[model samples]
Target: NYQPIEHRGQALWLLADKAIYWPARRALLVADVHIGKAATTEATLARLDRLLAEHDCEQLIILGDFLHARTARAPATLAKVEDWRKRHKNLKVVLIRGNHDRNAGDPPASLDIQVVDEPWVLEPFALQHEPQPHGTHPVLAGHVHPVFVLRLRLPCFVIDEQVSLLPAFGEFTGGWEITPASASRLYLAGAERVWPL
Candidate 1:
């Protein structure tokens, strides 16, 4: 289950496994959901369907890097996405262009999605693929693919960096190190506490 975490009057739901759920918009926010990862993880593409079913999301906001590459081919992943779209029927998908999205085929034409190259302003915040200085409103971005590395444990969810470094949602996607001191608050996926980290 997801719950809302508010900061400076803005509310967001931090889901387990790095996905952010925004109840205000009925949207699930994620970054770097490298959909083709199943090809490397298993010979058979089976997890794609399960992943979507597990989320059972109504609207999706992909921050960036949905695919490993513009040319990366993974028919299984596409089929799974198509199936999910058909099953959901009314799901609204919004994608912000990322650095790795060059030459990417038109998902709007092929898949049921809305695509844009610049930031999308939704009230007190701006949705972008990369981080910029926050103005009167906060800017939410996903290019960094943030993860926290610890001395004695597996990497944890990185909310330490001043800007929220969204976790890499794509299975095949990679992550970057985020220092704790830069962040004002960090929300570990399963923890109720907002660690200073």
Candidate 2:
């Protein structure tokens, strides 16, 4: 499922895959893949495959925290990531370095991903790894990995007035429960669907 919303005069799509898609920019935004943390890339890569197969996205912008830690870069895990990149070799990939990324270091060159720091200003949006308020643009970031509990503590998108947070894309990257704020809108991601709550 895809939910439509506007931010800073730009149209955006909130996807069931816990991702954001900007049709005008043809960009798909995902965060916190944490490729090596769980030591299994199958589930993580599968979702990215589904996202790529389903969208007309030209640029895949990862909001950051690409790696869990320096210890996560095992030979086996990196191999899986190498394979995942091969599958989407034609797509443009970019990563906004997050906190974990600071210690884990940037993704290798073989992946052909553009690695940049926070506040990657792109017109009306400041694509970031963490919230950074700007006068002219609304910030779209990741780092919170918000969760909401109804029955299950499921991953969710926490949309604030100026900054919006994305759920972690990695399967095992657990999140913290997010209580609603007066200025916040929440959308919980169901296992097989998405709900606006």
Candidate 3:
């Protein structure tokens, strides 16, 4: 279990699985699920399946980097993802095209992902694939794939006033080193727990 925090008067559950759970929307926010980049694609999808099965999730929003590169959308990769898609046939899925996606191309229509660009506004927040801060709203993004240098370096979530970053959720993705800033807090997502830094 993870603690829920108030952001701009809204509650968000920063999960141990390196994702965010929005109670109001019942949305699960994931970033950089680089399907083709890793060998354990089935496990990756299984993790997502676990989250959806356990939570009252209605929407699954991926913050870009859905495909690692042009080679990531191989027939093998797409087939595995399609199998997972069948299980959650009625779930809503959205993907904000990230830089990697620009090269890898949009996911196939079979997956039913509503692909869009950055800064998709959702009332008090702006959902994005890039790490840029939105001037009008708090930004929730995933491009950086931030990792805190504690515990000998582990993927982490950086919660800030302007942009809160999600750690990479893919199997073999790298992370950008980040320390807690004056206005931000770090949450190190380790084996079974998400502890604050």
RMSD of 2: 2.0
Question: For model 2, what is the error of residue 96's alpha carbon versus the real structure, in angstroms, after optimal superposition?
Answer: 0.6
Candidate 2 per-residue lDDT, tens place, 1-197, comes to 88888766778888888898899999999998777666366777788889888889898998988865656443477677778887788888888887767556678787778999887888777888876676777888888788887746888988876888898887554576787653588887776677888
List clash counts for every candidate, in order: 3, 0, 0
- Whole-model alpha-carbon lDDT for candidate 3: 0.82
Ranking by lDDT: 3, 2, 1
lDDT digits (tens) for residues 1-197 of candidate 1: 55456744657766665677666676677776776655242322243344345655677787767665534556566666666667656878888876565357546466778887636776656777776655655667777656655552222344322345666655533456556564445544434332334
User: What's the lDDT for all of these models?
Assistant: 0.60, 0.80, 0.82
**TM-scores of the models, in the given order?**
0.76, 0.90, 0.92
Question: Candidate 2 — number of clashing residue pairs?
Answer: 0
- Clash pairs detected, candidate 2: none
Return the candidate ranking by TM-score, descending.
3, 2, 1
Q: Candidate 3 residues 94-166, lDDT tens each?
A: 9988776765667878887788878788878898989897889999898777887754778888888899899
Off by over 4 Å in 1: 1-3, 38-57, 70-75, 106-108, 134-136, 152-162, 172-174, 190-196
Off by over 4 Å in 3: 72-75, 172-174, 180-182
Kindly report which residue stretches of model 2 are placed more than 4 angstroms away from their true locations once superposed. 73-75, 172-174
Best by lDDT: 3
TM-score of 3: 0.92
